[PDB]
Amino acid sequence: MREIVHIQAGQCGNQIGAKFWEIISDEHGIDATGAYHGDSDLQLERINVYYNEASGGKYVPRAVLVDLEPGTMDSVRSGPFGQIFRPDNFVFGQSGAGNNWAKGHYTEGAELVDSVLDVVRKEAESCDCLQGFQLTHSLGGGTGSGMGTLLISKIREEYPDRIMNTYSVVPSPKVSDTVVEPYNATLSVHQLVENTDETYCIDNEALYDICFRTLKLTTPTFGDLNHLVSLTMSGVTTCLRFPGQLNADLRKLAVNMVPFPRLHFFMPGFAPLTSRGSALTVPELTQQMFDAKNMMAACDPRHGRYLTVAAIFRGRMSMKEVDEQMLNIQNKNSSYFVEWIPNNVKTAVCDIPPRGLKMSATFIGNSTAIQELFKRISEQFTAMFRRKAFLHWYTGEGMDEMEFTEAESNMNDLVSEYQQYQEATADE
Amino acid sequence: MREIVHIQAGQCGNQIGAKFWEIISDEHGIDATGAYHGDSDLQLERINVYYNEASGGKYVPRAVLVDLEPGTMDSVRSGPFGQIFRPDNFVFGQSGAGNNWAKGHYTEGAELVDSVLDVVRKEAESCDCLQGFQLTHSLGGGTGSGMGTLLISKIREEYPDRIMNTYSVVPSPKVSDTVVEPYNATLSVHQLVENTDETYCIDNEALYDICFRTLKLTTPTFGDLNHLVSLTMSGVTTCLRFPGQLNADLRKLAVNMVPFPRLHFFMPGFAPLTSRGSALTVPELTQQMFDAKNMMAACDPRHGRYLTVAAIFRGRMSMKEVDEQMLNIQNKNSSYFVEWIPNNVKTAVCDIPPRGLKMSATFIGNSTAIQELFKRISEQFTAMFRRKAFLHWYTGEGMDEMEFTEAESNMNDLVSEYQQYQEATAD
Amino acid sequence: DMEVIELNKATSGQSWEVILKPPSFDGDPSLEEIQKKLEAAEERRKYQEAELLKHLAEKREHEREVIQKAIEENNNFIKMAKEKLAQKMESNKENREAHLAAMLERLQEKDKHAEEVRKNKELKEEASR
Amino acid sequence: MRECISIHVGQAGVQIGNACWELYCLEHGIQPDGQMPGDDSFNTFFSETGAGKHVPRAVFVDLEPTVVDEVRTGTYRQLFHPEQLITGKEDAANNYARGHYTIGKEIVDLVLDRIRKLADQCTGLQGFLIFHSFGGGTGSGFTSLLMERLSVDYGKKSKLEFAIYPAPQVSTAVVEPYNSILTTHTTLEHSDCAFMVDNEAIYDICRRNLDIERPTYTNLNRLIGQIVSSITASLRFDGALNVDLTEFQTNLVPYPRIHFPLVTYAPVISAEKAYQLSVAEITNACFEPANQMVKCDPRHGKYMACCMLYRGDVVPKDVNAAIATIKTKRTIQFVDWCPTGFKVGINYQPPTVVPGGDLAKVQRAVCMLSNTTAIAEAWARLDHKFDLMYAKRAFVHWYVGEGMEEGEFSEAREDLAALEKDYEEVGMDS
Amino acid sequence: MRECISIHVGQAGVQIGNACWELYCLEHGIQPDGQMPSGDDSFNTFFSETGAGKHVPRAVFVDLEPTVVDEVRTGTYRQLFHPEQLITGKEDAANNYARGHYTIGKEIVDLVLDRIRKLADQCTGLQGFLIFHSFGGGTGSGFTSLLMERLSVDYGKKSKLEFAIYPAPQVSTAVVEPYNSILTTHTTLEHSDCAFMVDNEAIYDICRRNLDIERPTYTNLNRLIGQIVSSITASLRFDGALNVDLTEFQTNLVPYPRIHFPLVTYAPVISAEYHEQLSVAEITNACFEPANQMVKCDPRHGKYMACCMLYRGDVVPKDVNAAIATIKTKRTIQFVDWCPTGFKVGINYQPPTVVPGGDLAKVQRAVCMLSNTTAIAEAWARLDHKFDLMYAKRAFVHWYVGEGMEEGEFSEAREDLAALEKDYEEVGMD
Ligand SMILES: Nc1nc2c(ncn2[C@@H]2O[C@H](COP(=O)(O)OP(=O)(O)OP(=O)(O)O)[C@@H](O)[C@H]2O)c(=O)[nH]1
Ligand SMILES: Nc1nc2c(ncn2[C@@H]2O[C@H](COP(=O)(O)OP(=O)(O)OP(=O)(O)O)[C@@H](O)[C@H]2O)c(=O)[nH]1
Ligand SMILES: Nc1nc2c(ncn2[C@@H]2O[C@H](COP(=O)(O)OP(=O)(O)O)[C@@H](O)[C@H]2O)c(=O)[nH]1
Ligand SMILES: Nc1nc2c(ncn2[C@@H]2O[C@H](COP(=O)(O)OP(=O)(O)O)[C@@H](O)[C@H]2O)c(=O)[nH]1
Ligand SMILES: [Mg+2]
Ligand SMILES: [Mg+2]
């Protein structure tokens, strides 16, 4: 369990993926040319989880950059850390997915999918001990959602024993590109329920609300939203890339987080909440675990119960104080944890804080309140599906209406399964 | 849709045809020898619609001149512009038609018709893109009416896909040559209803009344009547002869003007009314559209409704002012236009005024009031036919009485069809 | 009340028993079995891996069927558009030729009537006086 | 790469094509001879020869040679190869039946052969952009015939229109309502998206915003070229946000028959005056009826989709703020089955104006494409004019004489009656 | 000769082995390179000797992952061990018993057995095995149970003793540790002769209370565990008088095969940071205090079946007997009715040794009490309750089933630990 292969697909997938590589490169002391110029041994200890060592001291991200359109590839190449990526790892088509899940999953995506698998296969065969794959993508568009889910099932077929992990951006009318976002998102959730081991739900509804309500940004942009995503992704991957005891690899994390196979959708939490254009004690950080304002998925943790939680504290702080505050937070909020999974909160402390901060807290929650996110997508989906609006763009790609009804049923079953465990008592 | 082949038949047809050729030659800057000595490029832009280019820079009218008697053709050759015509295009007999439709249509006319078709085929076959044919003739005599309608059906048989257009002079007791004019005119209307696409009704009753009442000519002659006809023909062919958007060819005009195949008889209007030895404002010109005094057919436009109208303004004037005045004239007179043909009035403005004028207006109207012209012919016809007067003039030429009853029925049906559309509501 | 009993004495040690009270009341696996159990677990693990791959193979087949279905629908659309247009162009051709034939037959009938009129004028003329 | 083939049909289609291709040349730095002294997205609209010459991916077709002869002998005579300028001898005489059958069938194979030669030069053809009037015999009848033949040769490949809706102020024929209904009926199942431009709306914008007393086709077409250029700027350039032929269709068309977006454009400022509008100001102008390309009342309808195409000095932050204030407008109503109806595209290249034209150079402009049920008002006006004439069978003999049957008129009108009912049903609440 | 082979399994087993072998080297005068500048020759039970005069542990370090053992291969004692006794796989058991037992373990078990056989082949009087592992880890639980089974087949009449780490949430690495603990106890029960459980919470609290360590690390815990292990193995590695051979552990502490879990108590644990030396009475009194136990449980709620006192250092029999006489006087010390009330005492003259620079102070005398009490069933009850809470919902069970395990194995393992709880209850009746 050493190497992770990262894949980013479509516009959103490539924007949040480029930002992930730039934050973790800064934390690991790696400059835009792949050269290490840091001053801590902890920075290089597990550098090989995300980076390959190329000719003469340079480190190159084990990342494959995918799109059905070239513009996104060009903008990443032109971006701050664009030159760090392996040039032959950029795989792109010319046609685009036309914001259509069916085109990404069955038509244009199927024509480009073997070129992508040849590049991820080269990265995988080069691994001494491949852990699995991490995919960044949106669910509301065509390439990230349709082609990203096609890639997941193809990768599941060729690497059935590896962990499949996603950072999935959920659409919101508050930051919307296309009218068919609820269809593309429902068709992707159906794929994620069946084929991923861990999915981080990155909700644009929540990111917009943090920027507007807490950061007081009257008009948030994707840059403001992606600054919260990059801090969150740095926080959730902390135990994979620095020395530590807990959840040090994708499978140990899944075993600690996933009590039921379908219940693998995580609600990430982060404190402090910051803007790009610029405090915090241990008790203050631990409190944010139940604060809806600190969640990256638009769900209130107090509306459900945590099945499991991974709490990651970063910076120079007392491990003793963190241990005392984490016990107090659980004991004082016992009604928000299922009593039938004892010791379901695991804590880790890392000396290296995320880029731009001195102290932080990141919560990976498996909460039954995530059903609110799925219900919101489902109500938007049925409002369109009831009138069969825009259906001809999917049936014109060869799809049957039965796929829609099946994806909708699977997603409503997922909601109903979270509700079942939310109401379950220890005394059956 | 480039070339038009012109044919002029009989005394009347050749007199108004010679006058048409001299007015449009003057407007296009073409002298009596066919030489262009104009000044404007608009004059030559569409010169090929009516003229062929002969050896050297000369232009020769695509006109065939036809008569069963030689006299009018000799006077055409001797007249102003007589030498412009192609000498081999003069086709004439020696016998005459004795102001009898049957002689022109079946006897003498049938003996000369192949010599005429020889010449029109040569003209028509030489065209890059033939629009069709225009005929000038009277309806009250023998050659223009009888032989002219015979030529129409022969030319239709050989060119069924081309437009057939006529300038038909309707007879009147006010300027009459023969007692049988109502018979010759009814037999020709029967032919025109079935075989022309567009017919301009040039009424001698209206021409005489304009000269007598408005021009104060105590005793008008054909020269006085023909001056009104030449200005009217210059006005109605403006869009065929000069660059423009609207009704630029015979078929686009027919499609805009003719809602029902049989109702293709136009009432032309013209302002100002002048004599041979005589500028109005835009509002004054637009008003003349409903003035019975300005109609070249003896019908009152206020007695019926316009199915369609083409309004042509010529001279240096504001297109904006013409547009405003034309809207006002139809909004203030909405009851004189059928409401079930939306936007049925199309206007065009041309910088070149007709010869002798600085500003003019010409109206091509498809009005249900034209039924007054047909009723007048029909009442004259029945007063003679009821007693079978002069019938041996036609039966002596081989005709049957049945052709008279048929022509009469067809013409009365035409009146009854104009009345039907006049009374029709949108509902 | 304590009975001491010497047990052993050695180079780096000494031991004894101390008795406070006497008691109240006086007084095979096999390699084959292991291998059988391990092989049975391996066969269950291989069976669920094969079921997973069998379902993924069914998804690949469905993917091929949707591509095929879109292709077949485009082909049916082409076939239909082609025969609807061939039918429309031919019906129009028959109609336009029928209207043209009817109007030429009317003109031909006028010619027959004209020679009949000519024949009557001829017998009136000459066969008189 | 991502090519679009333009087909300009009849006088209106050809004259609007003259204005569009003149403007694209100015925007890409292409001289009238095809030479250009990097973006490179213009390759979607221009092919290149071995001599570095840039040639429009376009065919200009007319049944009469006069209008296309001006292209063949004008400023841009070297820009197009002679084989892509196609004309017959005789026009359709304002008759759909002559465009579709009698005259059009004589030239349709030649046009298809030329389009096949342009398609053979495409490595990723997106589809076809067809420019034509609804009113002319060629624009109506030949376009319908061509659309049907394109569906046979290319199946479902995208076909989008720029169609001129008839206006009496500049109308050339009484039968234009007939030509419009027949062409809409025949074309409905073959077209993916049609952008209608009402000549009365452009005429009034020219009089009001540009101070032109009596606007000519030159005034109308230069403004239309500006709108067409805005719709195709996302394809011919690579800006901050792009939208291709496919993205237009997906976001603007909820049902195959409901494919007529309303086009709105701002700002339209006269070359005189000497007085810059903000992103919020030009965005607000998109929802004002005076800036629409089709006369209709969006307050009497509901929005199903809105696509904003910005160009020039425009930043995403300023666009999102403007759309957020539009979302809070009670008077701008959306259908209840539409949770989100906004597709934004931004290009860096400011709107270029023809030297000596009527339009002022502006720093930023926007073209909104909206699917509003209010556009059914334009169909209702056209259908009423059709009914007034058809009740009497007025002018029908012209079509029947060319081989058409009266049953085609009833079917076309019944199809447009179903289209009117489709807009009514689609605007209903769930 | 009475050779003992040590087997260190998984991270906990390996890291505790590092602490134990570091301490044995200090106690026998063996340098980190295996040399000893030379007491008695009893150290040969734990160390073999090579042709170069080096002393090598009779030990195998095994892990399914290489990271922890790699520190042994490259650290201070890298020359103490031969590379063949440090065995690692590539991928760990991911905190899953089924993964370590059925999937991964199965591929390295023959290699480990081969190495054990090579160490056993060097013994003239092999006593048995001392196995160090955690209950909670996938390797410590699954691989250990698999290894115990094969060891019973290959060495039937050989003793097997365990030093097993009982899970504590303060340092817990996985939510499923109660599952791994019950599963490994069930499969290991019939193969183990005696298991000394060490509760991480008890050692964690002793480090905080007795050593003033705010947040104890594995280095702090293992150094304390190493003292206790050294105290128990002292009479095998030196010429002692009590627990002289491995069979004597079961004879002195285990009257029934299933009840083989003695409670370990140790004193004194003093911080390296002046202090008067604790007397025999003081360290003996500390033996009967719950705060000094290796497992959290209440000996008052149970009965003693056997008690072994292992004194070390400056200790005289007279003072031991006087100390035990006072304890009987003030305390009950209830023994089961079939066993006599009394103690087996051993004094090892070798002084307590501490790691230089560690957390523990050098003391003149220390004692380790090993008592088989029925109160240790409280630790099993706590573990069984956590198992039941999760198992009632089948939480995390899919991870084990996915590796080829059946749900029935969970029921069987839990039923076996329910029988173990009832055995402690029946045995403690009168
Ligand atoms: N905006 C605009 N409309 C035009 C232009 N030319 C013609 N139109 C309109 O188009 C309609 C007439 O159709 P045209 O395109 O001229 O006719 P056509 O397609 O050439 O057809 P035929 O001449 O009948 O063969 C009327 O509504 C005109 O106002 C132009 O350049 N610009
Ligand atoms: N006392 C002590 N406990 C430890 C140590 N390392 C791990 N543990 C405990 O052991 C349990 C986790 O098992 P590990 O031994 O780390 O796991 P493993 O045997 O390597 O198994 P996998 O990693 O799952 O293959 C938890 O209860 C830890 O607190 C150590 O050095 N000392
Ligand atoms: N957080 C975030 N969301 C984005 C970004 N870009 C696009 N999105 C969202 O992604 C969805 C559109 O999908 P997109 O990735 O652009 O389409 P694709 O290229 O077809 O995969 C919508 O929900 C957008 O709000 C980005 O940079 N950040
Ligand atoms: N306006 C006008 N009417 C004429 C002219 N010549 C004859 N007519 C009329 O034409 C009719 C007689 O026909 P005419 O052409 O002379 O006989 P044809 O030679 O047999 O055609 C009568 O109605 C005359 O009034 C003329 O030059 N101008
Ligand atoms: Mg035209
Ligand atoms: Mg481990």
Numbering used by the authors:
A (entry chain B): 1 to 278, 283 to 432
B (entry chain D): 1 to 278, 283 to 431
C (entry chain E): 5 to 31, 44 to 145
D (entry chain C): 1 to 37, 45 to 282, 285 to 439
E (entry chain A): 1 to 38, 45 to 279, 282 to 438
Paper text:
Here, we modified our original method for the preparation of human α1β3 tubulin to purify Drosophila α1β1 tubulin. We first determined the crystal structure of Drosophila WT tubulin within T2R, a complex composed of two tubulin heterodimers and one stathmin-like domain of the RB3 protein.
Based on this assumption, we expected that the residue substitution Y222F may produce a stronger bias toward the “out” conformation in the T5 loop, leading to rapid MT nucleation. In the case of the Y222F mutant, the T5 loop was “out” with bound GTP (note that we did not succeed in obtaining crystals of Y222F with bound GMPCPP), but was poorly defined in the electron density maps in the GDP state. Notably, 16% of the Y222F(GDP) oligomers were nearly straight (sampling time, 30 min), which is comparable to the probability observed for the WT(GTP) oligomers and well above that of straight WT(GDP) oligomers. Given that the T5 loop in Y222F(GDP) was not anchored in the “in” conformation, this implies a possibility that Y222F(GDP) tubulin nucleates MTs. Indeed, incubating Y222F(GDP) tubulin in the condition of the turbidimetry assay led to a signal that slowly increased over time. At 2 h after the onset of the reaction, using darkfield microscopy, we observed Y222F(GDP) MTs, which were substantially longer and fewer in number than the Y222F(GTP) MTs. Although GTP is required for canonical nucleation under natural conditions, the straight oligomers obtained with the mutated tubulin partially complemented the lack of γ-phosphate.
